[PDB]
Amino acid sequence: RTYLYRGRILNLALEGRYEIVEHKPAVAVIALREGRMLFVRQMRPAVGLAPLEIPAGLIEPGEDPLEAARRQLAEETGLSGDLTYLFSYFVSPGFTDEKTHVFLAENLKEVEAHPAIEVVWMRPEEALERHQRGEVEFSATGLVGVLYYHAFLR
Amino acid sequence: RTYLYRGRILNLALEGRYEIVEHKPAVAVIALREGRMLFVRQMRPAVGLAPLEIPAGLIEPGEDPLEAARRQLAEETGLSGDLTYLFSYFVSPGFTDEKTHVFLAENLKEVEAHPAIEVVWMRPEEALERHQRGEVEFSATGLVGVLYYHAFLR
Ligand SMILES: [Zn+2]
Ligand SMILES: [Zn+2]
């Protein structure tokens, strides 16, 4: 386990033949209101475009997933709600340890008028159609939100 | 766009204040048979455990997503089938450009008796329950497969 780089959002290390990227864990929040899902978009230099995602972000030191979820939702959209843990997933276990904890948010209320991040309320059916037509791209969190909705929220 | 490392499965670069990890695109295959989903497990040094995933892998030079999907399915499980493109997603757009193309596989047939990789046929409902109980972890591909099944394959 040798480190070739210790950065801000990640560290690059080696374990023999394997290249490993250590990354802070993350959270994502699925929120539905009047049939529309709460998506967000922002410039992502790593991909060169703005995919459709859901409120998400890194878990800061001292925070547990639930607290981080509350914060990301408030900071990115200015909303608060009753959160319920759903499940988690490793974004790409073949090279990184980033683990994402997904929550469901209900009974949304605005806690701050002042939420870089574009808030995009959109019916999940519409998001899926636009993607199938090649009009928009998805981040893992956005796709998970869309699939979760079709599976358990209709 | 400065490079601090050019490796095998990834490159580490910088774009001002952003740390970017360039990674080859990938594919994942969702397959259902007799109510069981085709999951796979393998040691993943980056995470320290073996999460529940679905057949997946990198797209090699010269290959398009469909061809890569056929190959990963055959090499990891020894099966072949009729593949249909479903959708794609960026695993973690906040730091990497890895994009995953997901396919559905139907009418499975064994093409090789000789498929590191553990083949795990399991009902998606069971996979979800075990995860909720904290008995198993999910990779993004495994979770996407489970959610896709609950949304459109029942
Ligand atoms: Zn931070
Ligand atoms: Zn290769």
XYZ file of N, CA, C and O in Angstrom, chain B residues 12-145:
536
model
N -3.983 10.174 -13.600
C -4.332 11.188 -12.617
C -3.868 12.531 -13.162
O -2.679 12.721 -13.427
N -4.807 13.455 -13.346
C -4.481 14.774 -13.876
C -5.070 15.906 -13.047
O -5.857 15.680 -12.130
N -4.673 17.130 -13.382
C -5.151 18.317 -12.689
C -5.595 19.383 -13.683
O -4.957 19.592 -14.715
N -6.706 20.040 -13.367
C -7.236 21.120 -14.187
C -7.464 22.291 -13.250
O -8.598 22.587 -12.871
N -6.374 22.947 -12.872
C -6.472 24.068 -11.961
C -6.615 23.569 -10.538
O -5.654 23.094 -9.936
N -7.826 23.663 -10.003
C -8.100 23.226 -8.641
C -8.718 21.828 -8.597
O -8.830 21.227 -7.529
N -9.107 21.306 -9.755
C -9.735 19.991 -9.808
C -8.807 18.812 -10.073
O -7.982 18.839 -10.987
N -8.968 17.772 -9.264
C -8.195 16.546 -9.399
C -9.080 15.627 -10.242
O -10.217 15.343 -9.870
N -8.558 15.180 -11.379
C -9.318 14.342 -12.296
C -8.676 12.990 -12.572
O -7.474 12.900 -12.825
N -9.487 11.936 -12.528
C -9.003 10.593 -12.808
C -9.619 10.110 -14.118
O -10.825 9.876 -14.194
N -8.794 9.990 -15.157
C -9.268 9.511 -16.452
C -9.318 7.995 -16.349
O -8.375 7.364 -15.876
N -10.420 7.414 -16.803
C -10.617 5.974 -16.704
C -11.335 5.466 -17.952
O -12.182 6.161 -18.515
N -10.991 4.261 -18.395
C -11.639 3.698 -19.572
C -13.128 3.498 -19.294
O -13.532 3.284 -18.150
N -13.964 3.593 -20.336
C -15.402 3.399 -20.136
C -15.649 1.926 -19.836
O -14.786 1.078 -20.086
N -16.827 1.619 -19.305
C -17.150 0.252 -18.938
C -18.535 -0.169 -19.391
O -19.313 0.633 -19.908
N -18.823 -1.450 -19.193
C -20.117 -2.015 -19.536
C -20.576 -2.897 -18.378
O -19.769 -3.331 -17.546
N -21.876 -3.151 -18.322
C -22.453 -4.006 -17.289
C -23.633 -4.698 -17.946
O -24.306 -4.108 -18.785
N -23.878 -5.946 -17.565
C -24.954 -6.719 -18.171
C -25.957 -7.246 -17.158
O -25.598 -7.988 -16.241
N -27.218 -6.863 -17.343
C -28.309 -7.307 -16.481
C -28.923 -8.557 -17.116
O -29.356 -8.522 -18.270
N -28.949 -9.660 -16.377
C -29.508 -10.904 -16.907
C -30.378 -11.606 -15.881
O -29.953 -11.830 -14.745
N -31.596 -11.961 -16.292
C -32.539 -12.644 -15.415
C -32.901 -14.001 -16.012
O -33.066 -14.133 -17.225
N -33.018 -15.010 -15.158
C -33.376 -16.348 -15.611
C -34.056 -17.081 -14.463
O -33.503 -17.196 -13.373
N -35.270 -17.558 -14.718
C -36.049 -18.268 -13.711
C -36.161 -17.448 -12.423
O -36.130 -17.995 -11.319
N -36.277 -16.130 -12.573
C -36.420 -15.266 -11.412
C -35.140 -14.882 -10.696
O -35.170 -14.076 -9.766
N -34.017 -15.453 -11.116
C -32.737 -15.136 -10.491
C -31.932 -14.186 -11.364
O -31.932 -14.304 -12.588
N -31.254 -13.237 -10.730
C -30.416 -12.309 -11.470
C -28.992 -12.846 -11.440
O -28.568 -13.478 -10.467
N -28.260 -12.596 -12.518
C -26.893 -13.061 -12.635
C -25.925 -12.074 -11.995
O -25.565 -11.071 -12.607
N -25.535 -12.342 -10.750
C -24.575 -11.482 -10.057
C -23.211 -12.163 -10.098
O -23.116 -13.363 -10.365
N -22.161 -11.388 -9.852
C -20.803 -11.920 -9.793
C -20.096 -11.233 -8.635
O -20.440 -10.107 -8.264
N -19.126 -11.926 -8.046
C -18.343 -11.373 -6.950
C -16.881 -11.696 -7.200
O -16.553 -12.719 -7.796
N -15.999 -10.816 -6.748
C -14.570 -11.039 -6.919
C -13.853 -10.172 -5.906
O -14.399 -9.171 -5.451
N -12.640 -10.556 -5.528
C -11.918 -9.747 -4.565
C -11.629 -8.394 -5.194
O -11.171 -8.305 -6.336
N -11.924 -7.338 -4.444
C -11.707 -5.974 -4.904
C -10.792 -5.274 -3.903
O -11.257 -4.708 -2.919
N -9.473 -5.305 -4.147
C -8.511 -4.668 -3.242
C -8.802 -3.211 -2.893
O -8.472 -2.758 -1.796
N -9.424 -2.478 -3.809
C -9.727 -1.075 -3.546
C -10.713 -0.887 -2.398
O -10.670 0.127 -1.701
N -11.599 -1.860 -2.192
C -12.587 -1.745 -1.125
C -12.362 -2.708 0.037
O -12.951 -2.543 1.107
N -11.516 -3.712 -0.172
C -11.222 -4.664 0.886
C -12.248 -5.762 1.092
O -12.193 -6.491 2.084
N -13.185 -5.888 0.159
C -14.213 -6.915 0.252
C -14.779 -7.221 -1.130
O -14.388 -6.594 -2.115
N -15.687 -8.188 -1.204
C -16.282 -8.568 -2.481
C -17.754 -8.181 -2.558
O -18.621 -8.909 -2.084
N -18.053 -7.023 -3.161
C -19.449 -6.596 -3.269
C -20.206 -7.397 -4.315
O -19.602 -8.094 -5.133
N -21.529 -7.296 -4.277
C -22.373 -7.980 -5.244
C -22.442 -7.074 -6.474
O -22.899 -5.933 -6.392
N -21.967 -7.583 -7.603
C -21.964 -6.835 -8.858
C -22.668 -7.684 -9.909
O -23.175 -8.759 -9.603
N -22.728 -7.179 -11.138
C -23.291 -7.953 -12.238
C -22.145 -8.020 -13.241
O -21.183 -7.258 -13.134
N -22.207 -8.945 -14.207
C -21.110 -9.029 -15.176
C -20.773 -7.656 -15.747
O -21.641 -6.946 -16.260
N -19.502 -7.290 -15.653
C -19.061 -5.984 -16.113
C -17.561 -5.963 -16.344
O -16.843 -6.872 -15.931
N -17.093 -4.910 -17.000
C -15.674 -4.787 -17.264
C -15.397 -3.602 -18.158
O -16.314 -2.894 -18.570
N -14.123 -3.387 -18.459
C -13.713 -2.276 -19.302
C -13.909 -2.559 -20.785
O -13.937 -3.714 -21.217
N -14.053 -1.487 -21.557
C -14.192 -1.597 -22.999
C -12.763 -1.499 -23.515
O -12.066 -0.522 -23.235
N -12.328 -2.509 -24.260
C -10.968 -2.526 -24.791
C -10.865 -1.755 -26.106
O -11.870 -1.494 -26.769
N -9.643 -1.365 -26.496
C -9.483 -0.627 -27.750
C -10.034 -1.418 -28.929
O -9.798 -2.621 -29.037
N -10.779 -0.736 -29.796
C -11.359 -1.381 -30.960
C -12.787 -1.846 -30.738
O -13.515 -2.124 -31.691
N -13.187 -1.921 -29.474
C -14.524 -2.369 -29.095
C -15.541 -1.263 -28.868
O -15.192 -0.177 -28.396
N -16.797 -1.542 -29.203
C -17.857 -0.591 -28.907
C -18.518 -1.226 -27.686
O -18.195 -2.360 -27.326
N -19.426 -0.508 -27.014
C -20.080 -1.063 -25.824
C -20.748 -2.427 -25.979
O -20.600 -3.299 -25.119
N -21.485 -2.616 -27.066
C -22.172 -3.883 -27.285
C -21.209 -5.066 -27.344
O -21.463 -6.115 -26.756
N -20.110 -4.891 -28.070
C -19.109 -5.939 -28.212
C -18.430 -6.226 -26.877
O -18.166 -7.379 -26.541
N -18.154 -5.172 -26.116
C -17.528 -5.333 -24.811
C -18.476 -6.072 -23.869
O -18.044 -6.902 -23.065
N -19.770 -5.771 -23.966
C -20.760 -6.423 -23.103
C -20.804 -7.921 -23.382
O -20.849 -8.733 -22.458
N -20.789 -8.279 -24.662
C -20.806 -9.683 -25.073
C -19.595 -10.402 -24.490
O -19.706 -11.508 -23.949
N -18.436 -9.767 -24.609
C -17.195 -10.353 -24.121
C -17.172 -10.514 -22.608
O -16.834 -11.583 -22.102
N -17.540 -9.465 -21.880
C -17.527 -9.563 -20.425
C -18.456 -10.681 -19.954
O -18.113 -11.455 -19.058
N -19.631 -10.773 -20.563
C -20.579 -11.808 -20.186
C -19.972 -13.190 -20.425
O -20.035 -14.071 -19.558
N -19.369 -13.380 -21.596
C -18.772 -14.669 -21.933
C -17.559 -15.023 -21.081
O -17.421 -16.160 -20.630
N -16.679 -14.055 -20.863
C -15.470 -14.304 -20.089
C -15.724 -14.492 -18.601
O -15.054 -15.293 -17.946
N -16.700 -13.772 -18.063
C -16.985 -13.887 -16.639
C -17.968 -14.992 -16.271
O -17.879 -15.549 -15.176
N -18.878 -15.337 -17.177
C -19.880 -16.358 -16.870
C -19.994 -17.495 -17.878
O -20.672 -18.490 -17.618
N -19.343 -17.348 -19.027
C -19.405 -18.384 -20.046
C -20.725 -18.408 -20.796
O -21.061 -19.396 -21.453
N -21.470 -17.311 -20.721
C -22.761 -17.232 -21.385
C -22.811 -16.210 -22.508
O -21.966 -15.327 -22.600
N -23.815 -16.358 -23.362
C -24.041 -15.437 -24.464
C -25.548 -15.256 -24.505
O -26.294 -16.110 -24.030
N -26.004 -14.143 -25.061
C -27.432 -13.914 -25.140
C -27.746 -12.780 -26.089
O -26.846 -12.233 -26.722
N -29.027 -12.451 -26.208
C -29.448 -11.351 -27.065
C -29.354 -10.110 -26.187
O -30.064 -10.000 -25.190
N -28.468 -9.189 -26.554
C -28.259 -7.969 -25.774
C -29.010 -6.745 -26.284
O -29.104 -6.516 -27.489
N -29.520 -5.952 -25.348
C -30.243 -4.729 -25.674
C -29.696 -3.596 -24.809
O -29.602 -3.727 -23.592
N -29.322 -2.489 -25.440
C -28.800 -1.344 -24.698
C -29.920 -0.703 -23.873
O -31.017 -0.467 -24.383
N -29.645 -0.419 -22.602
C -30.646 0.198 -21.730
C -30.371 1.671 -21.463
O -31.188 2.540 -21.779
N -29.216 1.944 -20.866
C -28.836 3.304 -20.514
C -27.386 3.340 -20.051
O -26.728 2.303 -19.984
N -26.892 4.538 -19.746
C -25.516 4.709 -19.289
C -25.463 5.700 -18.131
O -26.412 6.452 -17.902
N -24.350 5.698 -17.404
C -24.173 6.617 -16.285
C -22.699 6.842 -15.971
O -21.859 5.973 -16.208
N -22.394 8.025 -15.450
C -21.034 8.358 -15.037
C -20.949 7.904 -13.585
O -21.735 8.346 -12.751
N -19.998 7.025 -13.282
C -19.886 6.468 -11.938
C -19.715 7.471 -10.807
O -20.247 7.269 -9.716
N -18.977 8.545 -11.068
C -18.736 9.583 -10.068
C -18.145 10.789 -10.799
O -16.935 11.029 -10.760
N -19.006 11.569 -11.474
C -18.613 12.753 -12.243
C -17.850 13.844 -11.499
O -17.281 14.737 -12.130
N -17.833 13.766 -10.172
C -17.117 14.752 -9.386
C -15.606 14.594 -9.451
O -14.870 15.499 -9.049
N -15.124 13.454 -9.941
C -13.677 13.264 -10.028
C -13.199 12.361 -11.157
O -12.025 12.399 -11.517
N -14.083 11.541 -11.714
C -13.654 10.655 -12.789
C -14.586 10.670 -13.989
O -15.768 11.004 -13.875
N -14.045 10.314 -15.150
C -14.844 10.288 -16.364
C -15.324 8.892 -16.741
O -15.830 8.699 -17.844
N -15.175 7.923 -15.839
C -15.631 6.568 -16.143
C -17.128 6.592 -16.432
O -17.916 7.072 -15.617
N -17.501 6.094 -17.605
C -18.893 6.033 -18.021
C -19.218 4.560 -18.218
O -18.444 3.826 -18.839
N -20.353 4.130 -17.674
C -20.777 2.736 -17.762
C -22.018 2.573 -18.637
O -23.019 3.251 -18.426
N -21.938 1.676 -19.617
C -23.058 1.401 -20.512
C -23.696 0.090 -20.061
O -23.041 -0.953 -20.033
N -24.981 0.149 -19.721
C -25.706 -1.015 -19.220
C -26.583 -1.697 -20.267
O -27.331 -1.039 -20.984
N -26.486 -3.024 -20.328
C -27.256 -3.820 -21.281
C -28.119 -4.866 -20.597
O -27.837 -5.283 -19.477
N -29.171 -5.283 -21.290
C -30.050 -6.335 -20.796
C -29.717 -7.551 -21.658
O -29.547 -7.426 -22.875
N -29.601 -8.716 -21.033
C -29.291 -9.941 -21.761
C -30.444 -10.925 -21.628
O -30.885 -11.229 -20.521
N -30.930 -11.421 -22.760
C -32.031 -12.377 -22.754
C -31.656 -13.636 -23.526
O -30.679 -13.648 -24.272
N -32.436 -14.697 -23.340
C -32.198 -15.960 -24.032
C -30.756 -16.442 -23.868
O -30.063 -16.720 -24.850
N -30.318 -16.546 -22.619
C -28.966 -16.986 -22.298
C -28.679 -18.423 -22.712
O -29.544 -19.300 -22.619
N -27.452 -18.652 -23.162
C -26.998 -19.978 -23.560
C -25.512 -20.061 -23.230
O -24.796 -19.063 -23.324
N -25.052 -21.241 -22.829
C -23.649 -21.420 -22.483
C -22.817 -21.612 -23.747
O -23.105 -22.484 -24.570
N -21.795 -20.778 -23.906
C -20.922 -20.847 -25.072
C -19.548 -21.394 -24.710
O -18.778 -21.797 -25.581
N -19.240 -21.402 -23.418
C -17.958 -21.909 -22.953
C -18.075 -22.491 -21.549
O -18.603 -21.850 -20.639
N -17.586 -23.716 -21.387
C -17.632 -24.397 -20.100
C -16.632 -23.768 -19.139
O -16.805 -23.829 -17.922
N -15.584 -23.171 -19.697
C -14.549 -22.520 -18.903
C -14.732 -21.007 -18.985
O -14.161 -20.353 -19.858
N -15.538 -20.429 -18.079
C -15.761 -18.980 -18.096
C -14.449 -18.197 -18.137
O -13.392 -18.720 -17.780
N -11.220 -16.500 -10.120
C -11.226 -15.064 -9.862
C -12.641 -14.510 -9.710
O -12.922 -13.765 -8.771
N -13.525 -14.875 -10.633
C -14.906 -14.403 -10.603
C -15.870 -15.489 -10.124
O -15.890 -16.595 -10.659
N -16.667 -15.160 -9.113
C -17.655 -16.088 -8.574
C -19.017 -15.753 -9.174
O -19.476 -14.618 -9.062
N -19.655 -16.731 -9.815
C -20.977 -16.521 -10.401
C -22.005 -16.749 -9.300
O -22.024 -17.804 -8.666
N -22.850 -15.747 -9.074
C -23.859 -15.807 -8.026
C -25.275 -15.542 -8.536
O -25.709 -14.394 -8.595
N -25.996 -16.597 -8.904
C -27.375 -16.420 -9.346
C -28.171 -16.191 -8.064
O -28.062 -16.977 -7.117
N -28.959 -15.122 -8.022
C -29.745 -14.821 -6.831
C -30.966 -13.972 -7.162
O -30.895 -13.064 -7.987
N -32.096 -14.269 -6.531
C -33.284 -13.462 -6.776
C -32.959 -12.034 -6.341
O -32.378 -11.824 -5.277
N -33.313 -11.037 -7.165
C -33.030 -9.642 -6.804
C -33.660 -9.235 -5.470
O -33.105 -8.415 -4.739
N -34.825 -9.801 -5.162
C -35.500 -9.498 -3.905
C -34.638 -9.948 -2.734
O -34.575 -9.285 -1.697
N -33.970 -11.084 -2.911
C -33.109 -11.629 -1.870
C -31.850 -10.776 -1.726
O -31.393 -10.508 -0.615
N -31.290 -10.354 -2.857
C -30.093 -9.521 -2.838
C -30.381 -8.229 -2.079
O -29.579 -7.784 -1.256
N -31.537 -7.631 -2.355
C -31.918 -6.385 -1.696
C -32.090 -6.585 -0.193
O -31.608 -5.789 0.610
N -32.772 -7.661 0.185
C -32.996 -7.949 1.594
C -31.676 -8.147 2.335
O -31.468 -7.579 3.410
N -30.786 -8.952 1.764
C -29.496 -9.202 2.392
C -28.714 -7.906 2.561
O -28.002 -7.725 3.552
N -28.833 -7.006 1.591
C -28.120 -5.741 1.683
C -28.711 -4.890 2.799
O -27.973 -4.302 3.593
N -30.038 -4.834 2.862
C -30.721 -4.053 3.889
C -30.366 -4.566 5.280
O -30.404 -3.814 6.251
N -30.023 -5.846 5.372
C -29.653 -6.445 6.653
C -28.159 -6.284 6.926
O -27.667 -6.679 7.983
N -27.442 -5.708 5.966
C -26.013 -5.499 6.127
C -25.169 -6.743 5.931
O -24.030 -6.802 6.393
N -25.717 -7.735 5.234
C -25.004 -8.984 4.991
C -24.122 -8.924 3.749
O -23.137 -9.655 3.643
N -24.473 -8.052 2.810
C -23.699 -7.917 1.583
C -23.697 -6.469 1.104
O -24.613 -5.706 1.409
N -22.656 -6.096 0.364
C -22.534 -4.742 -0.168
C -22.827 -4.778 -1.660
O -22.789 -5.842 -2.281
N -23.118 -3.615 -2.231
C -23.427 -3.512 -3.659
C -22.422 -2.633 -4.384
O -21.875 -1.696 -3.810
N -22.191 -2.942 -5.652
C -21.373 -2.080 -6.488
C -22.495 -1.313 -7.191
O -23.662 -1.717 -7.123
N -22.163 -0.219 -7.860
C -23.175 0.543 -8.576
C -23.891 -0.366 -9.580
O -25.118 -0.310 -9.714
N -23.137 -1.206 -10.286
C -23.765 -2.087 -11.272
C -24.735 -3.075 -10.634
O -25.801 -3.344 -11.190
N -24.388 -3.595 -9.460
C -25.280 -4.530 -8.794
C -26.571 -3.857 -8.358
O -27.661 -4.413 -8.528
N -26.457 -2.665 -7.780
C -27.640 -1.935 -7.333
C -28.516 -1.547 -8.531
O -29.743 -1.666 -8.474
N -27.892 -1.090 -9.613
C -28.642 -0.714 -10.808
C -29.415 -1.919 -11.343
O -30.572 -1.793 -11.756
N -28.780 -3.086 -11.328
C -29.446 -4.288 -11.802
C -30.660 -4.603 -10.948
O -31.737 -4.893 -11.464
